[PDB]
């Protein structure tokens, strides 16, 4: 099994401390706290946008159109530090990248 | 050119270095200290050029268990994808 990693509720200005962690046979996890904690989207009612994504990525395997990986929003001069995203990717938020699990907290490989 | 000092004797724990990460680094104040939160940090955050001087570096492995070295890595693996990141082993 291969994760990867989305921003939830980003609009504008410094990125944020939510994610939504996604599997290859599409185990679902979310973070509000920047990776120290995942919790399993076990869904429910469709109410929050992790809920939303979640539900997005199990019916079409894939992320919705608002996201850009790092590199690629680099390429259109993303500056984190200055928080621009909002800026040379309007609507955009950063998501698709591989996610190495590394503390081991999301089941193995 | 950013720099960032890590004091390797200093290390009381792993989440102590984590701290002085986010101290060097000028991480965010939401930085989950850990290895997943630091590659993050990494690739979507710090502004480079880079240079990790790491004092004592060889205290620093004890004084975390063996959580120095993952810390490590990850700059590493950083560096190997085009961030440009000079790291010091002192």
């Given amino acids: ?109 | 050119m950013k720099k960032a000092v890590i004091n390797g004797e200093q290390i009381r724990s792993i989440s102590d270095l984590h701290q002085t990460l986010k101290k060097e680094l000028a991480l965010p104040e939401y930085y989950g200290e850990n290895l997943d939160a630091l590659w993050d940090c990494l690739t979507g955050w710090v502004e480079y050029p880079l240079v990790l001087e790491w004092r004592q570096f060889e205290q620093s492995k004890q004084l975390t268990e063996n959580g120095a070295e993952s810390v490590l890595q990850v700059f590493r693996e950083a560096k190997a994808e085009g961030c440009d990141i000079t790291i010091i082993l002192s």
Wanted: glycine fraction near 8%; charged fraction near 25%.
């Fill in chain 1, 1 to 109: 099994r291969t994760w990867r990693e989305a921003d939830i509720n980003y609009t504008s200005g410094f990125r944020n401390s939510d994610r939504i962690l996604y599997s290859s046979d599409w185990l679902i996890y979310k973070t509000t706290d920047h990776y120290q904690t995942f919790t399993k989207i076990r869904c429910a009612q469709v109410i929050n946008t992790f809920d939303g994504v979640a539900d997005y990525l199990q019916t079409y395997h894939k992320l919705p159109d608002n996201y850009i990986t790092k590199s690629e929003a680099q390429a259109l001069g993303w500056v984190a530090s200055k928080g621009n995203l909002a800026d040379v990717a309007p609507g955009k938020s950063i998501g698709g990248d591989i996610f190495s699990n590394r503390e081991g907290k999301l089941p193995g490989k």
